[PDB]
Ligand binder design. Structure first.
Ligand SMILES: [Gd]
Ligand SMILES: [Gd]
Length: 326
């Protein structure tokens, strides 16, 4: 599914463009009217539509944390369907934004904008996966709170950002419908490095593939350590915002373990990161099951919450080392 994965890298950067666009443009920045739900519902639809456009029959296999439905200020329930032309999308968004024409024409231009983001490494890869066995968990913009606050001035504690826009991630995971094993995953940090003078944000994309014993993943920059959420309350540890980011810390090797005790993460939070951690010999396990190892499945519903928490590990040896102490 390299051709599918290659296409998922594009829409992830297209999703990042929308995420960056809303914050960086005054009309969309200044924004009853729940903008974030709109920003989420829009990004997940753009991914859903673009993949159905390039691979017919994937549209109905793409699941996410948002619906394709928004309730405007009047109480009118609008089915978020974009295109086919740019004009149609402006008429749709104006029905949501009470007839804000400047904001509607702003989003539409970024949504229909072409992006040609292509890894030369993955062009060399020719892997075929049957499309009939694929299911996709999308998280449009993970760390919704941090995205809205928009802190560009946070100093990281030993490589790990406790808060800020660095914690915001676009998560796209692909899994096996029958076995429930994660196969492919894309993570896009829209906000990584901001130039102080031009105020522009540069992002960073990561991916991984684990299909029938073939394991490949994006080139990782160089340079136990445990990461937990800011609301964590169970017994060298770091606080860090965002589910997807804390998972990316394990992938980058900034942290050795990421443990979450509560049941308030779902399939769309973990799936993307899992597939990548799988491609590096690691993975994710049910915490409560380990305390009494098994991997997380993404095909059956408990509904779609990872009940009994999780542990995200890079090395199964480091997992045993950590599980020994506790
Ligand atoms: Gd989200
Ligand atoms: Gd999330």
């Amino acid at each position: 599914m390299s051709d599918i994965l290659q296409e998922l890298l594009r829409v992830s950067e297209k999703a990042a463009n929308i995420a960056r666009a809303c914050r960086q443009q005054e009309t969309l920045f200044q924004l009853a009217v729940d903008f974030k739900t709109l920003a989420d519902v829009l990004v997940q639809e753009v991914i859903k539509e673009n993949m159905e456009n390039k691979f017919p029959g994937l549209g109905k296999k793409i699941f996410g944390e948002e619906s394709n439905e928004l309730t405007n200020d009047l109480g009118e329930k609008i089915i978020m369907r974009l295109g086919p032309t740019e004009e149609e999308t402006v008429a749709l968004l104006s029905k949501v934004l009470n007839g804000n024409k400047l904001a509607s024409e702003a989003l539409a231009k970024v949504v229909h904008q072409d992006v040609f983001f292509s890894d030369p490494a993955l062009d060399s890869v020719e892997i075929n996966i049957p499309q009939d066995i694929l299911g996709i968990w999308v998280d449009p913009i993970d760390s919704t709170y941090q995205y809205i606050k928009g802190s560009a001035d946070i100093t990281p504690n030993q490589g790990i950002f406790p808060s800020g826009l660095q914690c915001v991630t676009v998560l796209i995971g692909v899994y096996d419908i029958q076995t429930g094993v994660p196969l492919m995953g894309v993570i896009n940090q829209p906000f990584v490095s901001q130039d102080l003078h031009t105020r522009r944000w540069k992002g960073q994309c990561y991916w991984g593939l684990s299909y029938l014993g073939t394991n490949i993943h994006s080139l990782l920059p160089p340079v136990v350590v445990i990461s937990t959420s800011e609301k964590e309350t169970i017994k060298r540890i770091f606080r860090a915002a965002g589910a997807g980011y804390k998972s990316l810390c394990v992938i980058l090797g900034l942290a050795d373990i990421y443990i979450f005790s509560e049941d308030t993460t779902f399939k769309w939070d973990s799936c993307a990161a899992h597939a990548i951690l799988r491609a590096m010999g690691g993975g994710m396990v049910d915490l409560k099951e380990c305390l009494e190892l098994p991997q997380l499945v993404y095909h059956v519903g408990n509904q779609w919450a990872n009940k009994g928490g999780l542990i995200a590990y890079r090395s199964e040896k480091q997992l045993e080392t950590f599980l020994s102490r506790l």
